[PDB]
Structure formats: structure tokens, C-alpha cells
Design a binder for these strands. Structure first.
Lengths: 129, 127, 169, 149, 139, 52
RNA sequence: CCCACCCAUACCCCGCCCUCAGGGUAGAAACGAUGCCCUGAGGAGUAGGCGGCCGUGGAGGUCAGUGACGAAGCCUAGGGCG
RNA sequence: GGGACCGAGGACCGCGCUCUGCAAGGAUGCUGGCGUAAUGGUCACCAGCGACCCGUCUUGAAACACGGACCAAGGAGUCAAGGUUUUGCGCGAGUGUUUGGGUGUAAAACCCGCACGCGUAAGGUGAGAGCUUCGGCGCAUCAUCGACC
RNA sequence: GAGACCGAUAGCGCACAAGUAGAGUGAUCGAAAGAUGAAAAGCACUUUGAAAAGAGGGUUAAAUAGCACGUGAAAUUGUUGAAAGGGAAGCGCUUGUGACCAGACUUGCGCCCGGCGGAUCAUCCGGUGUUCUCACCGGUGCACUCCGCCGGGCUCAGGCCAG
């Protein structure tokens, strides 16, 4: 879609930022992120901390977690590993538990400034069903 | 300056208005265009010898759209401060004083527009 | 406010009448017979209509109207004698003649420059009819008004060259 | 039109009237043209007919677009890997039917011919061998191409 | 931060108190707007760096934003009045708008606005008498 | 008269909108864009002495 | 049987409108980026689907809008725009 | 050689050539009359050609049938309750202030106690978006193999 | 006491001497109808007419507000002006005739000679500001430099139709 259905002015700035990055850079990461920004909310399901903790269990540590959705909290996870997560939104419990474990929280414009190619990024989605 | 910006020639594809079907016979029917909805209507089916239906093929050229034959564009003006908005558009826009503006306020508008070079389309109304 | 506004009231004489209980159609044809006539000839004509010596030609409202030889002066065949319309038009003509006398105009040169019969608001009357209906018997009154008036280059160079040569020769 | 001749006209890219294509003669393509004989006129063109069609009405398929063949460059960007770098190689490939005929003929947009100067014939829906216009003519298609150009 | 020139444009693109639009075009009443067109380029109030030229008694009055004083409107405008030859007014405005990278894209519009103001302060010529035209109007 | 005249809005939405409105009041371009004559006042989050 | 000729909104070339499709546009001398620039193709339409604009009464904001040398309404073989 | 219709774009860039520049990525040069109803436009009328009277209903379609003297004003898919799909927003294992109470510039706005409504209390291979130190890591999810209640 | 209600075919049937006038044996049914003007100053007087009324004259800012009263549409009608019409009119494309009109144009820019009126000419020195190298102000500047005006000449660009 040419125009996002959202009326968020900050989402419009993110679409403009990632339109320039998808046009001028040959990285297919930027094209995927731009596509997911255009999708609706039911097509952007939440991703809990326990699901991304599954995906850093192997050698995927020290890689930036990128989720084009809002990251929730799981009460079933007793310990949260140190991790660097970039997302559209974070809940208060998810942001507090990541920062208590020693990690850091980024927005998608901070990810663009830090990793414009999406280098060493572990990209995730939530459960569709 | 009175002369407008240089433009391509203004072409009107059709100057005649589009008359509503059977508005000539009935006085309860205004001549404003209404699209016929009957399946057997000859205007709807585009039979020859009948009234034409408007379409996007009659659309005017984008470079000459909304231009009066002098070559300017109309801009409705209610006071002196509206004329000063046309300060940088001497070659492209013209001023049109609104119908409810009084006689004293009009004289201020023309005097300012002559200073600014802006053409007034109805400068001789209340003189 | 009269209908003919091009005629100034200073040099003219006018007289009008409203809600006159005469037939509008008979008065329209009577006013058309005397339109543009002299004042003394119109007064003589209207009295002849009363005495049934001259006839008023019926032109528009003449449906199933009888024929007479007095319409041959007008070039028609259907002509009638509206006595009631002639009586009302005499009094309005005598009124305008008195208005000219008071103003000082000459009555011998007065013509009827404007005369108009307009429709008045309709009066109502009812009569009795069978099958549950009531017959409406509306009257059609008329408004009359009359006014009396005293009777009394961008040539080219080639065109300009031909003009000079004809003038010289 | 019956359903079978309709599909062949689509497969031969004859979607419009007065539309022309170049066909390599095989046994598979000859039976295609035999069915659409009540709708087409065909024959064997010479060097002149190939030249005027390419030079005057020659357009190329570039990214799904109809680009006129006004430069030797745009031939080289599209058929340069096949060994075709200019107009004369394109004309040589159509006339002397080479291995890259399929790529060169498909690169050419179907030719939008005009109606012939001088008309067809008194009645043109009979076969050419009974005084009509439909069917196969050996070299008289060159007289038809000259009028339609 | 939360606010920027890009964000203010998104809030005020559709509706603005300076916005005037009718059919033929969309204009702006902003004093910091030069050419008086509604766009991100000429939106003086939206942009951090902007220029605006208003008439004076004799000459032009050029105002410019100071980026350090953006939250202090009483001292946010750097005002210079050029009452001199028109050539020196144009040169100083061009230097003001292009020498130090303060809106070099607006240099042409700034010089053109100073010309149009000073073209309005010259004495005006009397209009020729209107000619009666045609048979009906002349008679 | 049973036409649902009043609208139920979440309290979190109201506090979000009130917080967004307070942030826009600190923006001096947004005050001029509304129609306020803010040119002769400094420090557009205007603070006056309570003793005064 | 032969030659020439007439013309459909059909085919060919050119212009203009609209839609669709493919590209360009930031160490911003930069933009109604909801814009502009380049290129090609397409255009009948009932039921039905989608979108954008016009108009009426009332409300919040705004134009420090218009107005008794005249608001609104009305008439107009007077014009302008679409 | 003789005609007809058109001049589209608007600094340079390109492909080329008959070379002190060219006809080569779209028209310039010279001249005349007029500078006003002259071109242009709007009505009225004549002339050449074209042209069933609208709507409803039936039917494959017509035909029949019904409504229509004219004008002005009014005039017909609305509201509520309960379900359901999609889009936007807030918070998110939670969410819902507005039954009520506390303030108030008083039917607004602001704040909130205890309950209550709805929900909540483990992989491989063919793959597979994406990343890569180019050795491999591989989201969601499908085919299948799975593990458990 | 109020209203994101209605505004004289609406809103209660009733904004008015409305449950009135009127209808029915009766129970009952049940309308239509607001507005001159700020102030009646609501035509003195004269004249014609039997009268109703009309014309002068007068009141008013307005009689284009005459208690048939604010504004005053359409259907329909009259008069005047223009036109058309050998068994329908009305409509579409295209000229022509006649009537009536909107624009456009009226000169601008530059250069060169003269003649006037003035020193916001270049540089430098002091303050101020700012984008920190650009400006403003005061002085110096004194007259081959700068700015206005007038009188000539030249170039370019200027409207409509054409070759």
C-alpha cells in the first residue's frame, strides 16, 4: 500500500525513513521491515520475551533482536537473558525486565542509525494462529 | 505587470454545457446534468443524435486548467490583506473582489492592487 | 406603479381601476379594440357598442362565438357587444380625460398610448349539484389601467488607397 | 469465431486487426496457421519487406514496454547476449532464420500495420485462390505489405 | 526528541491558521512564509531556519529565525531593515541566505520578494481612460 | 431520548491526549499555528512568580 | 472478368484527459514526498463492489473574515471557472 | 516535382553526419493589415444531416397493461438492544474511571475504594523471510515425522 | 433553570377571541389563520366620479412599505419590444444572418548620450547585532563614484488575423 492506514505521525516518519533506506540500499532487511510497517494490527501479532529467549538459546546471542510489533512480557520466564531488542513498542513490564537483566531497548529509528543494513540482526514475528 | 506568464494556447474541448434529458419539456426539471438510470434510456445507451454524457475525456489540459483567457487564475479577495497574498503571483494570479465587499473597501483593494501590479477582474464594479 | 414606465406622468394623463367585477375576457378584447386610438373616437365607439351599432372583434377569447357583418370593419367574422365592459371603460376614459383637464393638457390630441387588462383575485360562489358535488361558480374580475399621451472607421491601407484614387479622379 | 481459432490468434500474438507477426515455418507452426486461415493472410516476405517493417514499424519489448528501435544501443541491451548488437543483425536474423529467431521475433512487438492503400479486393473473405484475400500467397504478401506500410 | 520540523509539518499540513485555500491554489498567511505557498520548503513557522521579508516605510524588513532562541519568541527573530539602494539590499539578503548555509534553497525567493516589495513602493502611473466599445455601449 | 448521547472513552486515552496537548503547548510554532499572538512573550512555557 | 472511386466511433500517425504498471527524487541549493520528473500500455457496461469530490441545517476552533456608501434572499436575450 | 493536416517539449548533456556547422533527443526566420467587436463568445432564427415519450411491471425478448394537466413546499434503509467481520487507537496477561464515592469554575472536566464482566493462570527433514565472520545460523507457517493434556 | 431540538405545510390539534369556527341525533370528529413602519406621521387640501375609487398634492429614509401592507419565486395572465410558422413541437452536430457581450492592447526592460535635484558610492574607524563572517547604525567620505527625475536615440520583449 502507498499510504499506511495508521494516523500515527511518528509511524509516518518511520515509513518515510525506511522508504529512503529501502530505495537507496540493496539490503533486503529494509524492504521486509517497511512491508511489516504497512500491515495491520492483527497481522502484527505480539512477541513475548519467552519466544525471543527461545531464539537466543543457541549461538544467536550478541545479535540485535528486531521485531516489527510490540513486545509483551511472559510471567512464565523466570530468568531473562541479556539482550539487545529493537521494536515498535514495549510494554512497561517488558522494558523493565530487559533493563533489569542488563540489556538495552531500541526504537526502529535507532536501529536504522545503528544498523542500516540490518547486519547481525535476528528478525522475528509472533504466532499468527 | 499586467501581462501574464507565457503559457501554451488554451484549448476548450467543448464550450457547450451538458443539458439534462427532457429538461426542455418539463419545467420541474432543472437543466443541471443528471445521469439517466433507465436501462432503455437512449442517452444512457449512447444512441446517435442524442444528448452527450460528460466524461473524463473532455477534461482540460493540466497546464491551462483554471485559467481565464487573459492567462491568470482567479483568487477571491475580501480585504487588503488578501491582495498582499498575491504579491509574488503577479504573472500567474488575479484578484476577484467578493460580492459582499462594500464600496469603501473596494477602493482600497484596487489602489493596493495597482501598487502591487495585481490584476482585478471586477475593478469597475462600484465606481 | 403603472406598467408603462417610459411615459412621464407630467405630459400624460392616467387612470386605473382594481377589483372591477366585469368579465376579464370581454374587457381584454374591448381594450384591444381601442388601443392606440384617439380619445374622442374611442368614447364614440364604446357608446356604439352599448347601442349595438359597432362591434368589438373577439380574437383570442372567441370560442364558439357567433358571426356578424359588423366584424367586416375589423376583417374578422366573430364580433360581440360587451356592454358591461364598454360601460367600465367609458368611466375610466372620462376619468383620465378629467385628469388631463386638471393638468392643463389638450383633450383633442390625446391618444391611448397604453391600456392593459390584468386578472384580479377570483371571487367565489357555490351552487347545488347532484351526486354529492357542489358546483363552483367563481367570478373573474379584472384590473384595468390606461395612460393618455399627447400625439406629436477602421479601414485598411488598401481601402484608403482606393478612397484617395477615386477622390483624385 | 470458434474457440479453437480464438486461442491460436492469441498464441500467434494477433490480438488486433491489421496486426502482423513473423513465424518460423515448421510442421508445428504450419498447422496453427491452417486453422486461422478464415481470419489471416500470410506469405513469404522478401528482404525489402523485412527492412521496411523493422525500420518504420519496429518496436521492442523492454521490461514489458513498447520501445521504438531508434538506437542501436537498446538492441544491444536486450539482444546483445544473443550476438545481436544493431538493426542489421536483427534484420539478418529474421530474414535468414537463425538460431536466435525465437528471441528476436518475440523481442519485436507485433506490427501495427495500417489499412492497405488501394483496398484489398472486391470481396476479401474468400480464399486467395478464388479471388479473395484470406489464405496463403507466395510472394504477393509483399504487395500487401507495401500497401499496409 | 519528540518534536522536530518534520513532526510540526505532519500536524499542520492539513489545517493551519495561516492556511487559505480555494480551488485554484492553496496559500499561506504566515509572516515567515515567502512566496506565500503551502509547502514544507516555504513553511517558515514549521522549519527551524526560515526567512521572511515584510515591507518597511521605505525599504524592506528582513526577519530570520535564531536556532538557539527557538523557545523565546520575544528574541527569536533577527530583524534587519535595509533602507538603501536596491542593489545593496539584494546583496545583503543573498549573503544572509546563502553564504553560511542558512537556507540556500530560499535565496532566489528572498531576492525576488525584495524586488517585488520595492517594485510596490515606486509611484504608480495613471491608468488610461476606458474606451467605449461597440454600437450599444458607444450609443 | 434513548439515543446514546454520551461517549465512553478510556481513561488511558484521555490521559494520553491530555499529555499530548501539554507537550504541544510548549511548542512555539504550534501556538502560532493555532492562532495565538505569541510574539512579544519570552519562554513559551510561561512561568510567573506565584508571589506576584 | 477488369480498372478507378465513396465511407464506420474499425486500422495507422499526432495532440489532450483519466486510470493502471514500471523507474528516479537527502551528508537536503529542500518537498501542498498526500509533491514533482521519466517511460509504456489501456479506456462500452445492467446487478454488485471500491474510491474521491459537490451541496443543506446545527456545533468546537480559526480567518483580529464580509456588512446600512448595504448581509441574506430574489430576477437576469451579462460574464468567468470546472 | 506538386499538395493536405500537425509544431507536441522548453538552458546543456545523447545517438550521429554532407563539417568556419548540420536537416542529428518535437518550428524557426522574414513580412503585411488591424489594434477594435477584427478574431472569439452567448442567445434568436433559417439551412444540410442526425434523432420514438419518460418511468414501472412481465418476459428470452418485444407488444399489452399501469402512473404522468402544471408549479411551489414537504416526502421514504433511521434509532436502540444483542451478535459478527474488518480498519484506526490505548493498555497489554491483563483489561474496563463514570453502580457509587471525592473535588468542581457544577448535567462538563479531574480523581478513586471494594467488588464485578470477559480473558489468562516441546524439535528434525523438503522447505521457508532474513542474517552471515559466506563455515553456517534460520522467524512465522505448510507437507510429514513428532512430544503432551 | 436549561438544550449541537423545531422555526408558521415545521414544532403540541392550538405561536392568533383554539379544543375556537364548523360537522353529526349522539358517542365524537375537528381546521385554516403570525410579520407596514423607528414613529400612524394610516393621504390635509384640490379635482373627476352616484358611489367604490382615480389623478394631483402631501407623510416617510423608502406609498419600489396604501392596514388586499417586510422580502415577494414558480405555475398561469396582460401590455410593449424582437422573431418564427404549406398536417405537431421540443432535441444533437455544423455554418450563416441579426442582436448583445467578456477579454486582450494602451507599453515595459536594458544600454548609450545630455540636463537637473540630491549625497544611504568604494575604502577605513567606532559601537551594536548575527548564521562568527556577514550586516545595520554614526563618522570619514565632496564628486570620472552612487540614487532619483526629465529630454533624445538604439536593442529586446509586447495583442488579433494572415502571407
Amino acid at each position: 500500500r502507498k499510504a499506511p492506514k495508521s494516523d500515527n505521525v511518528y509511524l509516518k516518519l518511520l515509513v518515510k525513513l525506511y522508504r529512503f533506506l529501502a530505495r537507496r540500499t540493496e539490503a533486503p532487511f529494509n524492504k521486509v521491515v517497511l512491508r511489516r510497517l504497512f500491515m495491520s494490527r492483527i497481522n502484527r501479532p505480539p512477541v513475548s520475551l519467552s519466544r525471543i529467549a527461545r531464539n537466543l538459546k543457541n549461538g544467536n546471542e550478541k545479535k540485535t533482536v528486531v521485531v516489527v510489533a510490540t513486545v509483551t512480557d511472559d510471567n512464565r520466564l523466570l530468568q531473562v537473558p541479556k539482550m539487545e531488542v529493537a521494536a515498535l513498542r514495549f510494554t512497561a513490564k517488558a522494558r523493565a525486565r530487559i533493563e533489569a537483566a542488563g540489556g538495552r531497548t531500541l526504537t526502529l529509528d535507532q536501529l536504522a542509525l545503528e544498523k542500516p543494513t540490518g547486519a547481525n540482526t535476528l528478525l522475528l514475528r509472533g504466532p499468527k494462529n | 505587470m499586467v501581462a501574464a506568464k507565457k503559457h501554451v494556447p488554451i484549448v476548450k474541448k467543448r464550450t457547450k454545457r451538458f443539458m439534462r434529458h427532457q429538461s426542455d419539456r418539463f419545467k420541474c426539471l432543472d437543466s443541471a446534468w443528471r445521469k439517466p438510470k433507465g436501462i432503455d434510456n437512449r442517452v444512457r445507451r449512447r444512441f446517435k443524435g442524442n444528448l452527450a454524457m460528460p466524461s473524463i475525456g473532455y477534461g482540460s489540459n493540466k497546464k491551462t486548467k483554471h485559467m481565464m483567457p487573459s492567462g491568470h487564475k482567479a483568487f477571491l479577495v475580501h480585504n487588503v490583506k488578501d491582495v498582499e497574498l498575491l504579491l509574488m503571483h503577479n504573472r500567474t494570479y488575479a484578484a476577484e473582489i467578493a460580492h459582499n465587499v462594500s464600496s469603501r473597501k473596494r477602493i482600497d483593494i484596487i489602489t493596493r492592487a495597482k501598487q502591487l501590479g495585481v490584476k482585478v477582474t471586477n475593478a469597475k464594479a462600484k465606481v | 406603479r403603472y406598467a408603462a414606465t417610459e411615459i412621464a406622468p407630467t405630459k400624460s394623463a392616467r387612470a386605473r381601476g382594481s377589483y372591477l367585477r366585469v368579465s376579464f375576457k370581454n374587457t381584454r378584447e374591448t381594450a384591444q379594440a381601442i388601443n392606440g386610438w384617439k380619445l374622442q373616437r374611442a368614447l364614440t365607439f364604446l357608446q356604439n357598442v352599448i347601442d349595438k351599432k359597432e362591434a368589438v372583434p373577439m380574437r383570442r377569447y372567441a370560442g364558439s362565438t357567433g358571426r356578424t357583418a359588423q366584424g367586416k370593419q375589423w376583417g374578422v367574422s366573430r364580433a360581440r357587444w360587451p356592454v358591461k365592459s364598454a360601460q367600465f371603460l367609458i368611466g375610466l376614459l372620462k376619468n383620465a380625460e378629467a385628469n388631463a383637464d386638471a393638468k392643463g393638457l389638450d383633450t383633442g390630441n390625446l391618444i391611448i398610448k397604453h391600456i392593459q387588462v390584468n386578472q384580479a383575485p377570483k371571487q367565489r360562489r357555490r351552487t347545488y349539484r347532484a351526486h354529492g358535488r357542489i358546483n363552483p361558480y367563481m367570478s373573474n374580475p379584472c384590473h384595468i389601467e390606461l395612460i393618455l399621451t399627447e400625439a406629436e472607421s477602421h479601414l485598411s491601407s488598401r481601402q484608403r488607397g482606393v478612397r484617395i484614387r477615386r477622390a483624385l479622379t | 469465431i470458434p474457440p479453437k481459432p480464438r486461442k491460436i490468434l492469441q498464441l500467434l500474438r494477433l490480438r488486433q486487426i491489421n496486426n502482423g507477426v513473423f513465424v518460423k515455418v515448421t510442421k508445428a507452426t504450419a498447422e496453427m496457421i491452417k486453422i486461422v486461415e478464415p481470419w489471416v493472410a500470410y506469405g513469404y516476405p522478401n528482404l525489402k519487406s523485412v527492412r521496411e517493417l523493422i525500420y518504420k514499424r519496429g518496436y521492442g519489448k523492454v521490461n514489458g514496454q513498447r520501445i521504438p528501435l531508434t538506437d542501436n544501443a537498446i538492441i544491444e541491451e536486450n539482444l546483445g547476449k544473443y550476438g545481436i548488437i544493431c538493426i542489421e543483425d536483427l534484420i539478418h536474423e529474421i530474414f535468414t532464420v537463425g538460431p536466435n529467431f525465437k528471441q528476436a521475433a518475440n523481442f519485436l512487438w507485433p506490427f501495427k500495420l495500417s489499412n492497405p492503400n488501394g483496398g484489398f479486393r472486391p470481396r476479401k473473405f474468400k480464399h486467395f485462390i478464388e479471388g479473395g484475400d484470406l489464405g496463403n500467397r507466395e510472394e504477393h504478401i509483399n504487395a500487401l505489405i507495401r500497401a499496409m506500410n | 526528541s519528540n518534536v522536530s520540523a518534520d513532526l510540526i509539518w505532519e500536524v499542520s499540513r492539513n489545517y493551519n491558521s495561516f492556511l487559505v485555500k480555494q480551488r485554484t491554489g492553496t496559500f499561506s498567511r504566515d509572516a515567515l512564509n515567502l512566496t506565500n505557498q503551502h509547502s514544507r520548503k516555504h513553511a517558515g513557522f514549521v522549519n527551524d531556519k526560515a526567512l521572511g521579508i515584510v515591507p518597511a516605510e521605505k525599504g524592506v524588513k528582513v526577519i530570520a529565525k535564531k536556532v538557539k532562541a527557538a523557545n523565546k519568541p520575544a528574541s527569536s527573530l533577527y530583524t534587519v531593515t535595509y533602507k538603501s539602494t536596491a542593489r545593496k539590499a539584494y546583496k545583503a539578503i543573498a549573503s544572509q541566505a546563502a553564504k553560511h548555509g542558512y537556507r540556500a534553497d530560499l535565496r532566489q525567493a528572498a531576492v525576488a520578494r525584495a524586488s517585488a516589495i520595492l517594485r510596490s513602493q515606486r509611484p504608480v502611473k495613471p491608468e488610461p481612460p476606458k474606451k467605449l466599445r461597440g454600437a450599444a455601449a458607444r450609443r | 431520548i434513548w439515543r446514546k448521547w454520551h461517549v465512553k472513552i478510556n481513561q488511558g486515552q484521555k490521559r494520553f491526549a491530555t499529555a499530548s496537548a501539554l507537550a504541544a503547548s510548549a511548542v512555539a510554532p504550534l501556538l502560532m499555528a493555532r492562532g495565538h499572538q505569541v510574539s512579544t512573550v519570552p519562554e513559551v512555557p510561561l512561568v510567573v512568580d506565584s508571589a506576584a
